Write an enzyme that holds these catalytic residues in place. Structure first.
Site, PDB file in Angstrom:
ATOM      1  N   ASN A 147       0.810  -1.215   0.000  1.00  0.00           N
ATOM      2  CA  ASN A 147       0.000   0.000   0.000  1.00  0.00           C
ATOM      3  C   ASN A 147       0.849   1.275   0.000  1.00  0.00           C
ATOM      4  O   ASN A 147       0.356   2.337   0.387  1.00  0.00           O
ATOM      5  CB  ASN A 147      -0.962  -0.015   1.197  1.00  0.00           C
ATOM      6  CG  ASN A 147      -0.245  -0.278   2.513  1.00  0.00           C
ATOM      7  OD1 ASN A 147       0.955  -0.058   2.621  1.00  0.00           O
ATOM      8  ND2 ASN A 147      -0.979  -0.750   3.515  1.00  0.00           N
ATOM      9  N   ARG A 285       2.917   8.948  11.052  1.00  0.00           N
ATOM     10  CA  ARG A 285       2.563   8.567  12.414  1.00  0.00           C
ATOM     11  C   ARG A 285       2.025   9.804  13.115  1.00  0.00           C
ATOM     12  O   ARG A 285       2.591  10.892  12.975  1.00  0.00           O
ATOM     13  CB  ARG A 285       3.771   7.989  13.198  1.00  0.00           C
ATOM     14  CG  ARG A 285       4.200   6.528  12.853  1.00  0.00           C
ATOM     15  CD  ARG A 285       3.041   5.558  13.014  1.00  0.00           C
ATOM     16  NE  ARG A 285       2.780   5.195  14.408  1.00  0.00           N
ATOM     17  CZ  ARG A 285       3.634   4.553  15.201  1.00  0.00           C
ATOM     18  NH1 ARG A 285       4.713   3.952  14.717  1.00  0.00           N
ATOM     19  NH2 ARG A 285       3.382   4.480  16.509  1.00  0.00           N
ATOM     20  N   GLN A 314      -4.507   6.408  18.753  1.00  0.00           N
ATOM     21  CA  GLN A 314      -5.156   5.798  17.599  1.00  0.00           C
ATOM     22  C   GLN A 314      -5.807   4.498  18.053  1.00  0.00           C
ATOM     23  O   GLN A 314      -5.113   3.619  18.601  1.00  0.00           O
ATOM     24  CB  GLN A 314      -4.170   5.554  16.460  1.00  0.00           C
ATOM     25  CG  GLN A 314      -4.864   5.379  15.120  1.00  0.00           C
ATOM     26  CD  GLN A 314      -3.928   5.543  13.955  1.00  0.00           C
ATOM     27  OE1 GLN A 314      -3.889   6.593  13.312  1.00  0.00           O
ATOM     28  NE2 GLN A 314      -3.181   4.499  13.658  1.00  0.00           N
ATOM     29  N   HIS A 333      -7.648   6.431   9.829  1.00  0.00           N
ATOM     30  CA  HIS A 333      -6.505   5.690   9.310  1.00  0.00           C
ATOM     31  C   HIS A 333      -6.996   4.697   8.266  1.00  0.00           C
ATOM     32  O   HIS A 333      -7.437   3.601   8.606  1.00  0.00           O
ATOM     33  CB  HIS A 333      -5.773   4.989  10.449  1.00  0.00           C
ATOM     34  CG  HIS A 333      -4.440   4.431  10.059  1.00  0.00           C
ATOM     35  ND1 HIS A 333      -3.853   3.376  10.726  1.00  0.00           N
ATOM     36  CD2 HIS A 333      -3.578   4.785   9.077  1.00  0.00           C
ATOM     37  CE1 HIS A 333      -2.696   3.091  10.157  1.00  0.00           C
ATOM     38  NE2 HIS A 333      -2.507   3.927   9.152  1.00  0.00           N
TER      39      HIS A 333
END
Ligand code: NA
Ligand code: NA
Ligand code: NA
EC number: 1.17.1.9
Lengths: 370, 372
Positions: A147, A285, A314, A333
Site C-alpha cells: 500500500n 505517524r 489511535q 486511518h
C-alpha cells in the site's frame, strides 16, 4: 491441522456489503523498482471485495477449512479478556492489519504456546516484539509494498484539498449554500509552491513523482540521499537536515517512522521555522506532530492547513481536537486499506500461508525475521 | 471622463478579510505553451488578496479614480431594476467575472448607450451576446489562460477525492467516528485506471499532464487531434468520438465548452456506454450533463461518483439534487477564482484597461471581438 487467529476491523455499520461499486481492479505487474505483486497459487475472492473487515476474512476461510484447519476471525483484540488473547494460547498463526493491530507483546508471545507465524496483512512489524519472536522461533512477515502507492495518492489528494480549500467549499455546496468568496478566501493554486518531503522511501518518492507535473518546486530531506539521476529528473533540492528544509516550503509532507528523534518533531519550537500559512500533510505517524502544537499553529495562522490519516491516540478519541480544528483535512486511518490495497495484501497473506503450510520458502522481501 | 461598471460577487459572510493565510503568491513566469502572464504597468494589490468580491474591486479603484474616471462596483446584477442595469445606461466599460456574471443580453446592450468595452475578468464571454457587440463596435476581451491551471488542479483533486472516497471519510472523522470499513467500502486507488478527457485544450491537457505520474492510462477525444509529439510524450490514446471513448474509461473528465452538440451529451442513453462504477468530473459546464440522468446513474451504481464545480441552474438552487446525492464531490463554482487566479485576471483586467484608455492595442490573444 493448524489454528489460525486473524484479527480484522468491524464490518460497515450497515452490514457487510453484497455488491461493490466496480467489478474488478486494474491489473499491475510490479511496484516501482520491480518487486512483483503478490503471487498466491489462487485466490478465493474477487479483487475489489472488502477483505479487511471481520466478514471479509481476507478471503482465507474456504482455503483454510478445506485443509482441516481452524480459522478464528475477530475484532475483539484488546486486553487480556479479549477473544484474541484467549484464543491466542494455542494459535499456530496470528494475522492482523496495522489498521486494527493485534499486539504481540512479550507477555502475549509467552502466552502463545503454539505460535509459529506472525503475519502482518499490510506493512511493518512494530506491533510485534521481534526479539521475543526470534527467541521463540516465530517467523514474522509482511506484504511489502502492498500500500505504498495507496498512501502516496492519499497524500497528494490531501495536499490539493488543503491548498484549494476543498473540504469547507464542499460543505457550502452540501449545505445548500454558494458563497463563492467564503470558499475562495482560503483557496490557492498549488502551482509554483514549494513542497518538502521529510524522507523519500517508497511513499515519499511516489509522492514527489506525483507532484512533479503540478509545477511545484520539490525539496526533500532523508537519512540517505536519492541517486543523482532521480534528483535531476525530478528537479529535487536536497537538504542535510529537515530544519534546513522547512523555511523554504509552502507544503511539508512527513514520511518517517516514529522514533525518539522524530517524536513530536513538529512542535511549538520547530513550527517557528515554517513559513506563515504553511501546510502539513502527515500520513506517517500521529505522534510526529505535537497534537496541541498543531492546534495552536492553526489558531495563530502559522499553519493554513493540516491533514493526514494518522492520529494519537489511535483510534482517535471522539473529542480529539484535530477532528474539528479549522482548515483540517483529516480522515480515519484508511489510506493503506483501500480496496485496491486490500486485494494485494489479502493475496500476499494467502501466498505466505501457502509457502508456510507447504514448507516452501517465503519471499526474502516478505521476511522480517525467521 | 469614463464610467467603468464592475460587477463582483459578495464579500464573505464574516466580512472582507483583514488578514490572509499567507503574505504572497508563488511567482509564475509563463503559461504552458509560452503565453506571458498579464503585464499591467502596475498593480495596486498584493497578490493573494481577495480581489473578486465587492470590496476587492479587482484592485482597480485607485487607478481609475486617479485618472478622473467613475468606478461603480456592485453585486446587484439581476433584473431590470438592479444596480447593474440602472448604471449600465451610460457605462463606457463593463467588467464582470463568469463566477458572478453581469449578462450583456441584446436588450441590455441596446440600452447601454455608451458601451465600448465588455471585459471578462476571467475566461470566455458566455454571458455576452457577441452579435450585438459586433454590430455595435463593442470590444469584448478576456484574460486568456488566467485560470486554466487552477481548473486543472481542481479536476485532479476531485478525481482523487471521488476514487479514494475522501468526502465521506472526512465526514466520519469530523463527526467523531472512526469506521474504517465504512470509509473504505467505496475507496479505491487511482493507480492503473483509465482516465478519458473530453477535449484537450488548456485545461484538459494540463489535467492529462498531472494525471500521468499516477500510472493511469490516458485517453482523450477532441474536435482537433493533438500533435503527435504531445500524444507520444504522454502516451495518449486518441478516440474519434466521445462515444468511442466512454467504454474504456474508469474516470471521465469533461473539459469541453457548452454548445448545441455538447448539451446533455451525458444523458440516460450515453451513460449506458460507461463502465459500471465509472466516475465523472465536470468543471466545464453543468448542462453538459442531464441533471437527473446523473442522479439516476448514481442511484443505479452506473456511476460510483460525480464531482465538479459547475451546475445548472447556476447559481445552484438550495435544493439542487447534486448537493445531496450519494458519492458526490461537488463545490460551488470556485475553481477558476482561487486567490492565485484572481491575482492574474485582476492584473490582466488592469492591463487591458490601460491599453484601452491609452489608445494602445489590446493583446490579440485577449480579444474575442475587436471592436474599435
Ligand atoms: Na513560494
Ligand atoms: Na465500521
Ligand atoms: Na499596459
Amino acid at each position: 491441522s493448524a489454528k489460525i487467529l486473524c484479527v480484522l476491523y468491524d464490518d460497515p455499520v450497515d452490514g457487510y456489503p453484497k455488491t461493490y461499486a466496480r467489478d474488478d481492479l486494474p491489473k499491475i505487474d510490479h511496484y516501482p523498482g520491480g518487486q512483483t505483486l503478490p503471487t498466491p497459487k489462487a485466490i478465493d475472492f474477487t479483487p475489489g471485495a472488502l477483505l479487511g473487515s471481520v466478514s471479509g476474512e481476507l478471503g482465507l476461510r474456504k482455503y483454510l477449512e478445506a485443509n482441516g484447519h481452524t480459522f478464528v476471525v475477530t475484532s475483539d483484540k484488546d486486553g487480556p479478556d479479549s477473544v484474541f488473547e484467549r484464543e491466542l494460547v494455542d494459535a499456530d498463526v496470528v494475522i492482523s492489519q496495522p489498521f486494527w493491530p493485534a499486539y504481540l507483546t512479550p507477555e502475549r508471545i509467552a502466552k502463545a504456546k503454539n505460535l509459529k507465524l506472525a503475519l502482518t496483512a499490510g506493512i511493518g512489524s512494530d506491533h510485534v516484539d521481534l526479539q521475543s519472536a526470534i527467541d521463540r522461533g516465530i517467523t514474522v512477515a509482511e506484504v511489502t509494498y502492498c500500500n505504498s502507492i495507496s498512501v502516496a495518492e492519499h497524500v497528494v489528494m490531501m495536499i490539493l484539498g488543503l491548498v484549494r480549500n476543498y473540504i469547507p467549499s464542499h460543505d457550502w455546496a452540501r449545505k445548500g449554500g454558494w458563497n463563492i468568496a467564503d470558499c475562495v478566501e482560503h483557496s490557492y493554486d498549488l502551482e509554483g509552491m514549494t513542497v518538502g518531503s521529510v524522507a523519500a522511501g517508497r511513499i515519499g518518492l511516489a509522492v514527489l513523482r506525483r507532484l512533479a507535473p503540478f509545477d511545484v518546486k520539490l525539496h526533500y530531506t532523508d537519512r540517505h540521499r536519492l541517486p543523482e539521476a532521480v534528483e535531476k529528473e525530478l528537479g529535487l533540492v536536497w537538504h542535510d537536515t529537515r530544519e534546513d528544509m522547512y523555511p523554504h516550503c509552502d507544503v511539508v509532507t512527513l514520511n518517517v517512522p516514529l522514533h525518539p528523534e522524530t517524536e513530536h518533531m513538529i512542535n511549538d519550537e520547530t513550527l517557528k521555522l515554517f513559513k506563515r500559512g504553511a501546510y502539513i500533510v502527515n500520513t506517517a505517524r500521529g505522534k510526529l506532530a505535537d497534537r496541541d502544537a498543531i492546534v495552536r499553529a492553526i489558531e495563530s495562522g502559522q499553519l493554513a492547513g493540516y491533514a493526514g490519516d494518522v492520529w494519537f491516540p489511535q483510534p482517535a478519541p471522539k473529542d480529539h481536537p484535530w477532528r474539528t480544528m479549522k482548515w483540517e483535512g483529516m480522515t480515519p486511518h484508511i489510506s493503506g486499506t483501500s480496496l485496491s490495497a486490500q486485494a494485494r495484501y489479502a493475496a500476499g497473506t494467502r501466498e505466505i500461508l501457502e509457502c508456510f503450510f507447504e514448507g516452501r520458502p517465503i519471499r526474502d522481501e516478505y521476511l522480517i525475521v525467521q
